[PDB]
Amino acid sequence: GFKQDIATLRGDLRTYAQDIFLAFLNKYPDEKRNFKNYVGKSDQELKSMAKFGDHTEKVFNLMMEVADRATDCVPLASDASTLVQMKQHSGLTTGNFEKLFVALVEYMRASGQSFDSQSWDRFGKNLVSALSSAGMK
């Protein structure tokens, strides 16, 4: 279930974070404008940049903290507020996050492993609604 999936992801966090983020960027090419240092580069070129692996892992580490503090796949309002108020998120709307979670669930369903894809779909939808309640447009 959802708690075991957090343990599966954390055990190899660097690899899962890179592969899910690449799946997102390739599914939604217009989303790459939030990341100007990544434009015009193949997947393997991206993986050779120190900050691509480091920052992508740090994003997924915070995602796993929020997931583990959730109740029945509903995140804490305080965690949603942190994501709204981060200076690095100043340009964003809930649609950016909606798309990330569509790509994450698609990756889990295609992987050939027993992820609880339905719980991750709920988590993404409940995170989007919490972001709106915490003040994201």
Ligand X SMILES: c1ccc2[nH]ncc2c1
Pick one of ligand X, its own copies, ligand HEM, none as the site partner of residue 3 (Cβ within 5 to 8 A by kind).
none
Binding characters for ligand X, 50-79, by CB under 6 A (x = yes): -----xx--x--------------------
Query: What is the phi-psi region of residue 112: left when phi exceeds 0, alpha when psi lies from -120 to 50, beta otherwise?
Result: left
* Longest CA–CA separation in the chain, Å: 40
82 binds its own copies (CB under 8 A): no
In angstroms and rounded to an integer, the radius of gyration of the C-alpha atoms of the chain is: 14
Binding characters for ligand X, 78-117, by CB under 6 A (x = yes): ----------------------------------------
* Long-range Cβ contacts of 75-78 (<8 Å, 24+ apart): 75/123, 75/126, 75/127, 75/130, 76/130, 77/130, 77/133, 77/134
* Candidate residues 63, 103, 108, 128; the one interacting with ligand HEM per rule CB under 6 A: 63
| Distance in Å, CB of 135 to ligand X, minimum | 20
In the chain, alpha helices (H): 2-11, 13-27, 43-47, 50-69, 77-85, 94-110, 117-133
Q: Which residues bind ligand HEM (CB under 6 A)?
A: 31, 34, 54-55, 58-59, 62-63, 66, 88-89, 92, 96-97, 100
Q: Which residues bind its own copies (CB under 8 A)?
A: 7, 10-14, 54, 57-58, 61-62, 64-65
